[PDB]
Design a protein around this motif. Structure first.
Motif, short mmCIF file in Angstrom:
data_model
loop_
_atom_site.label_atom_id
_atom_site.label_comp_id
_atom_site.label_asym_id
_atom_site.label_seq_id
_atom_site.Cartn_x
_atom_site.Cartn_y
_atom_site.Cartn_z
N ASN A 66 2.13 -10.78 -5.94
CA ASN A 66 2.43 -9.37 -5.78
C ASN A 66 2.36 -9.05 -4.31
OD1 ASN A 66 -0.30 -9.74 -5.58
ND2 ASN A 66 -0.84 -7.85 -6.63
N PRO A 67 3.10 -8.03 -3.87
CA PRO A 67 3.20 -7.79 -2.43
C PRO A 67 1.84 -7.56 -1.74
CG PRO A 67 4.91 -6.62 -3.61
CD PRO A 67 3.97 -7.13 -4.64
N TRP A 68 0.81 -7.17 -2.48
CA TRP A 68 -0.44 -6.78 -1.85
C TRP A 68 -1.57 -7.81 -1.76
CZ3 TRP A 68 1.93 -3.24 -5.34
CH2 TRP A 68 2.63 -2.23 -4.67
N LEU A 69 -1.38 -9.05 -2.21
CA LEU A 69 -2.50 -9.98 -2.11
C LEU A 69 -2.63 -10.58 -0.70
CD1 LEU A 69 -2.35 -13.48 -3.90
CD2 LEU A 69 -0.28 -12.28 -3.31
N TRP A 70 -1.52 -10.97 -0.08
CA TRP A 70 -1.62 -11.56 1.26
C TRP A 70 -1.39 -10.53 2.36
CZ3 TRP A 70 -4.13 -15.66 0.53
CH2 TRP A 70 -3.83 -16.56 -0.48
#
Ligand SMILES: [Mg+2]
Lengths: 179, 234, 155, 60, 181, 175, 126, 314
Positions: free
Chosen positions: C113-117
């Motif tokens: 998902n766009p928000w983990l890294w």
């Protein structure tokens, strides 16, 4: 046929849709995040490239060509954007109107006189069209995810744009090669 | 199952093989993939969905815009069962049979053909008959016995063709889902007959000028002599 | 064959006992009992008739029919199309492509998902000689040494 | 058509009604079962001694 | 799963709970690599195997859990990946059509692609670990302690570069938790 | 001449009006379509799709501050042999494992040594016999075989090697 | 011959020739979560990485977000993002319907009208 | 954390979006308490109010066992039906017959055709109509050629298309699916609207449908069954239930022709551009046709639209 003959047109009062507000099968806005790109000092074309790839959705690992999912890039300070050497004075912008007299050859300086924003829009157009031409919805839909503001004042405080930290790997200045 | 043969129809229509046509299969209408040309893979549920549901609506189907038939009414189905009786057995013939076996061989086969067919289309209509006993009417509950009598068939309450099952081994029999075929006919006709007797007494209890006098004389008389022929009382 | 159960149920074999085209009769003679002994669960029903359909047919456990044209085909071929009947559950035909190699998609760790890294920043191996810092005495001496050196050579 | 040609293998469904005729049809019982007509050789005329009686001292 | 094994005890007791729960594998089969879960179904190119048989898969490139990841240089030992042959069938026809404009010759080539369709049953893993491995300086670290980071990691701001683009200050000073504790 | 009319006559349903109605027009349309896609499939889409895969793995590396250009090289160097398709699968469905690959690359961890040339044992050069016994090289290689039998998984054979070599003496009737 | 429209990989910082020397890999990843990936050496010659799980990494992300937004407060985008991190940590399933759907159907809670036709949590026969 | 007060409906509407499991496990307890209080006080408004929102809350739970158990022992079916205008006689028929209905609902909803194939094979070895409920009556729906799934947007300006929809019911080849989603959606816009037109048109809609259900022609999905059918932990309303059904019997009853009754204006007519997810990697175009996936994985692909027709009858 599948795609209709009666088509939405520019002269037709219904008007042309905005893809940001549109709801369609291939448009996903759920997982997007907002970026802030400060253009001070960075070369126009490079900024166009980076912005084009955040906007297009290519910076994601799960990016798929037919599924248009972009990040909104707020490009700030278009006025300070740096084009190397004589290029401001020497780099053409050419378009052809269909009518007697099909040549407008117009210097970057003139476009910069009229709007600075149109320069960034122009090179974004180019860098998006480099991979997408053959379908209109794939050309036009990404471009609306650019927000071009020619100085440091923008409405978008509410989206908390994250400063996009980018250094251009390319050492040499940009080079105009167009046949 | 959409286009070819419905729930209560009398056709045997083979949907996958076209046996009624005058022409080779030129253009296959529902098709998903371009690999359907040389190996259509019909017979899979998901592709025969796409084929059978693209067929044009028949006289049986009565497609959406067109008004359809009221079939599930018991008051249609019973005279339907009755018009089967006058088919195999002629009026003259009926009379001779009513009297009391001396009958033309040729003629005899018509009686057993009547029995055969009546069995079949009872098998077809009973999934629509079992739906409708509830709002069925006093005349056409009685018609159930009249029509079985006229077709010269005795109804199983525990000559009669309705008692035995058609022979075949259960491994070889067709169990395919979606085709409405009741495997125990004599067990579910019996409890159809019992049900339709039990409902009759309900409506005769419900029914208690000279028109009503003569009517209530006569149909009360018809009950014991028609149910009595099938061996049922009350 | 799913969870220890064959998906095939019936094999329909129609043939003419007296008329001609011996292949199906051959098949009944020499190759069928080798099949039946190997796959006992499959009910084979034989249909003698005057003008036989020359196709083999399987019937699966979801109510799916599958058939192969056997006309003047060798019993070896018929045996093989039979064994082709058993080996399929007849549920689907997916193409063989890269996206069709995995029938269902699954993540053990989790999906990107766009928000983990997103909230990671670049870091340095060894810690930074901060520009604004209080110089130690050895540091003072070394740096002033350097400045005085370049000033000396210049002047 | 021809064995090789793709027209062969057509009619994947519908060739047989899936349901037995309740007079002539039967299940294969096993290896102990004698099938009418079945012989290991390609006989286009599967006549036995009963159908086409041969007159000679010994069956050839 | 027979547990991980090492000549050091602390490392064994540390990484023992690490290997529990669902494991995915990366499997080389017939020149095609597969991401493999426990209940997953794959279609491999045609294997000659009886239907409903029980199979182990030899080539295993990588195995990992939610917690651990074992990266095989070229291959791994100890991995038990047990699958079950489900079908063997030819998949959807790819029709190739070859026609030369000059010649009247048309060639219709059907390619049903034969395949073995595989359901997976177990993934077990039992490594033999040698020791902790320093990744910034190449070494096998002799003593193992979980609490201290093997390689600590430092922020980038010198003050030396004026034109370094500033990401938000909480992204730049963020210290990360101790996982093994 | 064979134009394949009789197969493609069954497809027409996927064509719009003029082609699906009239036969020859439709057959020309289908012949054109299928020849076109055949040509394209054999020479081009192979490149388009691997371009897509490269793009995904590359952006997934971009999140980690490197790119395809280094990652390719050092997946080559450390002898990982992950196909780019698999790297895409790891990037999308197991970000942590892909990250682990990336940091296997970026670390200084010695890549595995090159494969060994199979070498002659010293005991091949021992003359046999010197002056009902086994050539020593043979029993040494037997050792080396039994060890790799015991190396694969647990088994009822046990882990002890010696008596497993000597296992031929239990089938031997003592005279 | 046609112009090549396949996607192009971004340029990457040029090496200083230090990379040429052996024992120096040319991949440089030194990142926030880097120290947590612990490398162990297998007997095979392969490696073994120990890493924090999915929800731990995302929880770290959430902590950094909250810690950057403690000062200026949380903006709407921050709100939505924190909500989604908080959901995806606890997920246990897959989400197939648009996030806005629930809000669109529950809009009547937000905008109240006159009391003649006013809609409540029970309506019929009242 | 505060007792000595029953939680109103708004709260349970609020806790249906949070994915945190212990929160929901806590809130369920609160729901039980609140219902028993409300039943003690004999006030319909608080109770029914507690039923609607509570229903949504139960659709938000992951475990269906606890949900169905909860819905039946608190009796959501009867109670909810007694609220609606003309659905009354179908209210008590349920509480008479549910002990029988629960007997006919199959153990699993996966691989239905196989289940009833074995259920056909048993019958080869040697009726008063109850309320038509979709899960018990699965075997019926395979006999039926066409299924009309009712949606509430039909009631605008007229009832006539519904009326023409129940003309086809006696044909024996057709059936009408009426969920509790569309019933509720009908009753709430019977009392709410810009116009005095669609209110009347919903008003008689309810009695048409009630008549057909009591007569045993149409078919009803009760809340309890709705819970079992729909995929775990997913929210469902009078848009999604239409499509959870339409995906269900497109997957599990492949030969039944599914028609959808809607208004040409309505959003849910095109489930793949509206009603979609995000870009989800765990779903694919073929996710409609595999047995392991959730039903709501179907609507990212146009294949749900292929198999599902939507018509205006007359
Ligand atoms: Mg290729």
């Amino acid at each position: 046929p599948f795609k209709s003959v009666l088509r939405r047109h520019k002269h037709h009062p219904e008007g042309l849709p905005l893809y940001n507000d549109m709801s369609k099968q291939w448009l996903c806005r759920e997982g997007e995040r907002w970026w802030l790109l400060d253009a001070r000092g960075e070369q126009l074309p490079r900024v166009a490239a980076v912005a084009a790839q955040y906007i297009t959705g290519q910076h994601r690992p799960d990016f798929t060509p037919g599924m248009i999912t972009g990040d909104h890039v707020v490009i700030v300070n278009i006025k300070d954007v740096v084009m190397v050497g004589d290029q401001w004075i020497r780099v053409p912008i050419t378009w052809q109107t269909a009518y007697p007299g099909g040549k407008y050859r117009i210097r970057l300086t003139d476009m910069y006189e009229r709007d600075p924003c149109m320069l960034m829009w122009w090179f974004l157009k180019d860098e998006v069209n480099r991979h997408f031409v053959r379908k209109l919805k794939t050309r036009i839909a990404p471009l609306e995810k650019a927000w071009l503001y020619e100085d440091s004042i923008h409405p978008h405080a509410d989206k908390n744009p994250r400063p996009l930290c980018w250094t251009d790997p390319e050492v040499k200045g940009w080079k105009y090669r167009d046949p | 199952v959409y286009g070819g043969s419905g729930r209560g129809d009398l056709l045997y229509e083979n949907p996958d093989a076209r046996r009624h046509s005058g022409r080779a299969l030129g253009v296959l209408n529902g098709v998903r993939h371009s690999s359907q040309a040389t190996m259509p893979e019909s017979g899979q549920l998901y592709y025969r969905k796409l084929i059978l549901h693209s067929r044009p609506p028949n006289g049986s189907c009565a497609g959406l815009q067109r008004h359809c038939h009221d079939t599930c009414n018991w008051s249609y189905l019973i005279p339907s069962l009755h018009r089967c009786a006058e088919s195999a057995i002629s009026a003259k013939l009926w009379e001779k049979m009513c009297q009391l076996v001396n009958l033309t061989q040729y003629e005899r086969q018509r009686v057993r053909d009547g029995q055969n067919l009546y069995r079949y289309e009872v098998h077809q209509r009973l999934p629509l008959l079992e739906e409708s006993i509830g709002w069925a009417q006093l005349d056409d509950l009685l018609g159930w016995f009249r029509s079985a009598r006229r077709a010269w068939v005795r109804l199983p309450t525990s000559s009669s063709a309705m008692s035995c099952r058609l022979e075949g081994h259960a491994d070889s029999r067709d169990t395919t889902p979606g085709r409405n075929q009741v495997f125990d006919t004599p067990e579910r006709v019996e409890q159809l007959t019992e049900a339709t007797v039990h409902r009759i007494r309900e409506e005769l209890q419900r029914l208690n000028s000279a028109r009503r006098l003569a009517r209530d004389e006569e149909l009360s008389r018809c009950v014991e002599e028609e149910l009595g022929w099938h061996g049922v009382a009350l | 064959s799913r969870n220890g159960e064959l998906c095939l149920k019936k094999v329909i074999i129609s043939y003419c006992p007296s008329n001609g085209a011996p292949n199906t009769r051959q098949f009944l003679a020499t190759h069928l009992p080798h099949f039946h002994a190997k796959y006992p669960s499959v009910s084979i029903d034989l249909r003698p008739r005057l003008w036989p359909e020359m196709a083999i047919t399987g019937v699966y456990r979801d109510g799916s029919e599958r058939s192969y044209n056997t006309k003047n085909l060798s019993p070896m071929g018929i045996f093989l199309r039979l064994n082709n009947l058993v080996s399929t559950a007849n549920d689907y035909d997916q193409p063989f492509c890269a996206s069709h190699l995995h029938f269902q998609r699954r993540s053990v760790q989790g999906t990107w998902n766009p928000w983990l890294w997103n909230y990671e920043t670049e870091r340095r191996r060894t810690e930074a000689p901060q520009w604004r810092r209080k110089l130690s005495e050895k540091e003072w001496d070394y740096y002033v040494g350097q400045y005085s050196a370049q000033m000396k050579q210049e002047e | 058509s021809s064995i090789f040609s793709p027209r062969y293998d057509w009619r994947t469904s519908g060739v047989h009604d899936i349901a037995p005729r309740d007079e002539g049809d039967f299940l294969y019982q096993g290896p102990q079962h004698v099938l009418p007509g079945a012989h290991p050789l390609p006989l286009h005329h599967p006549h036995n001694t009963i159908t086409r009686p041969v007159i000679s001292p010994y069956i050839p | 799963a027979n547990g991980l094994r090492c000549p050091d005890a602390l490392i064994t007791r540390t990484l023992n709970p690490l290997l529990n729960g669902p494991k995915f594998a990366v499997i080389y089969c017939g020149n095609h690599q597969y991401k493999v879960a426990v209940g997953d179904v794959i279609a491999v190119q045609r294997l000659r195997v009886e239907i409903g048989s029980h199979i182990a898969l030899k080539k295993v490139l990588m195995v990992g859990g939610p917690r651990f990841t074992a990266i095989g240089r070229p291959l791994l030992e100890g991995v038990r990946v047990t699958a079950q042959v489900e079908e063997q069938k030819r998949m959807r026809n790819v029709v190739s059509l070859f026609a030369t404009p000059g010649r009247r010759h048309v060639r219709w080539v059907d390619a049903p692609h034969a395949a073995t369709i595989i359901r997976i049953c177990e993934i077990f893993y039992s490594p033999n670990v040698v020791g902790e491995l320093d990744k910034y300086k190449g070494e096998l670290l002799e003593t193992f302690t979980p609490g201290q980071h093997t390689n600590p990691v430092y922020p980038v701001d010198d003050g030396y570069d004026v034109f370094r683009k500033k990401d938000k200050e909480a992204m730049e000073n963020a210290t990360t938790f101790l996982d093994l504790l | 001449h064979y134009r394949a009319k009789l197969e493609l006559d069954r497809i027409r349903s996927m064509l719009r009006g003029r082609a699906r109605l009239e036969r020859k027009v439709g057959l020309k349309r289908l012949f054109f379509l299928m020849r076109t896609q055949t040509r394209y499939r054999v020479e081009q889409q192979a490149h388009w799709e691997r371009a897509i895969v490269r793009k995904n793995v590359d952006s997934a590396a971009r999140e980690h501050g490197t790119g395809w250009q280094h990652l390719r090289n050092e997946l080559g160097r450390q002898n990982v042999m992950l196909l780019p398709r698999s790297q895409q699968l790891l990037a999308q469905y197991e970000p942590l494992a892909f990250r682990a690959v990336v940091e296997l690359c970026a670390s200084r961890i010695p890549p595995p040594p090159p494969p060994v040339v199979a070498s002659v044992p010293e005991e091949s050069y021992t003359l046999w016999p010197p002056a009902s016994l086994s050539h020593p090289a043979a029993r040494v290689e037997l050792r080396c075989g039994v060890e790799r039998v015991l190396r694969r998984g647990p088994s009822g054979l046990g882990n002890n090697v010696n008596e497993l070599i000597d296992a031929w003496k239990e089938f031997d009737v003592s005279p | 011959p046609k112009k090549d429209r396949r996607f192009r990989v971004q340029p990457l910082p040029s090496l200083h020739a230090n990379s040429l020397a052996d024992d120096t890999p040319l991949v440089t990843t030194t990142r926030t979560l880097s120290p947590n990936f612990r490398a162990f050496a297998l007997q095979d010659g392969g490696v073994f990485f120990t890493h924090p799980s999915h929800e731990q990494v995302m929880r770290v992300g959430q902590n950094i977000l909250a810690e950057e937004t403690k000062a200026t407060g949380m903006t709407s985008m921050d709100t939505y993002v924190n909500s989604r991190i908080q959901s995806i940590i606890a997920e246990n399933t897959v989400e197939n319907v648009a996030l806005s759907h629930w809000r669109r159907r529950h809009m009547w809670n937000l905008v109240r009208t006159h009391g003649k036709l006013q809609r409540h949590w029970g309506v019929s026969d009242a | 954390s505060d007792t000595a007060s029953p939680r109103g409906p708004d709260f349970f509407a609020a806790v249906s979006r949070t994915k945190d499991t212990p929160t929901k496990k806590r809130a369920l307890c609160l729901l039980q308490e609140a219902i028993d209080n409300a039943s003690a006080k004999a006030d319909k408004v608080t109770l029914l109010g507690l039923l609607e929102s509570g229903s949504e809350f139960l659709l938000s739970l992951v475990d269906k066992g606890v949900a169905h158990t909860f819905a039946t022992q608190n009796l959501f079916d009867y109670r909810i039906l007694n609220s609606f205008l003309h659905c009354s006689l179908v209210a008590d028929r349920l509480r008479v017959e549910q002990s029988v209905i629960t007997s006919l609902i199959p153990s699993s909803l996966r691989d239905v055709q196989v289940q009833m194939l074995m259920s056909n094979e048993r019958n080869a070895l040697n009726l008063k109509r109850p309320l038509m409920t979709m899960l018990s009556q699965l075997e019926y729906l395979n006999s039926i050629d066409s299924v009309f799934i009712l949606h509430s947007s039909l009631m605008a300006t007229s009832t006539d298309q519904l009326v023409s929809a129940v003309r086809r019911l006696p044909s024996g080849k057709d059936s009408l699916i009426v969920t509790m989603s569309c019933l509720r959606a009908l009753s709430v816009k019977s009392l709410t609207s810009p116009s005095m037109k669609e209110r009347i048109a919903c008003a008689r809609a309810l009695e048409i449908v009630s008549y057909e259900l009591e007569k045993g022609r149409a078919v009803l999905l009760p809340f309890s069954e709705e819970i079992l059918l729909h995929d775990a932990g997913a929210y469902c309303d009078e848009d999604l239930m239409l499509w959870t059904v339409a995906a269900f019997l497109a997957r599990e009853l492949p030969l039944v022709k599914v028609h959808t009754l809607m208004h040409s204006n309505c959003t849910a007519r095109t489930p793949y551009r509206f009603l979609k997810g995000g870009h989800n990697l765990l779903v694919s175009s073929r996710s409609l046709y595999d047995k392991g996936a959730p039903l709501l994985s179907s609507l990212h692909s146009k294949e749900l639209r292929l198999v599902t027709h939507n018509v205006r009858l007359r």
